[PDB]
Design a protein around this ligand. Structure first.
Ligand SMILES: Cc1nnc2nc3ccc([N+](=O)[O-])cc3c(-c3ccccc3Cl)nc1-2
Length: 283
């Protein structure tokens, strides 16, 4: 840590504070996150899983646990807010989704889940790239109810199988989260802004329909499923994400499939016709 000069605090992660910092030797500017050997082993393995749309883990220092990350200047949440009045142009939305799916496809091919995808851990630069931060840390530390600052961890992007009590969920949970984020960029409003687990579930239910054995085999048997769940009817995506075109609505509906086994994969999504005219605009 004596190798680093903290430049400024740039935020608070789930697990610890994040600083902008400079390497005193190399002058390299990095992001420094300050936070059990099983966790150390898991994180170490993540150091080799490099991809251009994954925020690079440069180093792990343990003496307290410090993670040294590639630095980017802005997060997507701030950009979405800054864009709220005009909306992010479709071509940039399309480019960001395309890149995020490439990041998911890579990590998932290695059987690593993110588990807590949200706008606040997607980072962007002036060159039009977008990258996922905190990938893999959920398996290392778990996903708390509150952050280290007691802030409520958002439920808005949490897949329904997690909410319904499944212990062994899949890479599909990340596709769900990304679909929620996709819808949010398009409409400029959170798709399912739940303020508790049950409110989160019911918001999902009110839009996509209360799931049954027809749409989701095995659902009524899950740990936290209750037969007393109100039965809401499914709404049209035309009503959910106007004015997204039918290619976009088709892809989104597949990313939000209830059955995790049927939910579209990152690799399959990259081949969806929605990305036929994908380009790489700069923000
Ligand atoms: C890793 C990593 N590398 N560069 C980073 N740059 C940032 C620039 C702006 C903002 N911000 O909030 O304005 C946050 C970050 C974060 C970050 C901080 C707290 C919680 C989560 C995240 Cl992702 N992390 C970065």
């Amino acid at each position: 840590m004596e190798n680093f000069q903290k430049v400024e605090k740039i935020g608070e992660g789930t697990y610890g504070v994040v600083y902008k910092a400079r390497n005193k030797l190399t002058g390299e500017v990095v992001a420094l996150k300050k936070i059990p050997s099983t966790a150390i082993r898991e994180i170490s393995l993540l150091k080799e899983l490099n991809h251009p749309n994954i925020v690079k883990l440069l180093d792990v220092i343990h003496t307290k646990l410090y993670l040294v990350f590639e630095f980017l200047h802005q997060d997507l949440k701030k950009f979405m807010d800054a864009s709220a009045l005009t909306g992010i142009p479709l071509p940039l939305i399309k480019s960001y989704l395309f890149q995020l799916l490439q990041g998911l496809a890579f990590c998932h091919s290695h059987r690593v889940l993110h588990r807590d995808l949200k706008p606040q851990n997607l980072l962007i630069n002036t060159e039009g790239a977008i990258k996922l931060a905190d990938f893999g840390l959920a398996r290392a530390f778990g996903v708390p109810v509150r952050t280290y600052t007691h802030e409520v961890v958002t439920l808005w992007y949490r897949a329904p199988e997690i909410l319904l009590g499944c212990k062994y969920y899949s890479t599909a949970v990340d596709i769900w989260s990304l679909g929620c984020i996709f819808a949010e960029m398009v409409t400029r409003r959170a798709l399912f802004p739940g303020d508790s687990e049950i409110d989160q579930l019911f918001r999902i239910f009110r839009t996509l329909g209360t799931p049954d054995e027809v749409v989701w085999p095995g659902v009524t048997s899950m740990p936290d499923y209750k037969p007393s769940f109100p039965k809401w009817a499914r709404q049209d995506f035309s009503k959910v994400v106007p004015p997204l075109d039918e290619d976009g609505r088709s892809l989104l509906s597949q990313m939000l499939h209830y059955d995790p086994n049927k939910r579209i994969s990152a690799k399959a999504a990259l081949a969806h016709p929605f990305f036929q005219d994908v380009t790489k605009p700069v923000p």
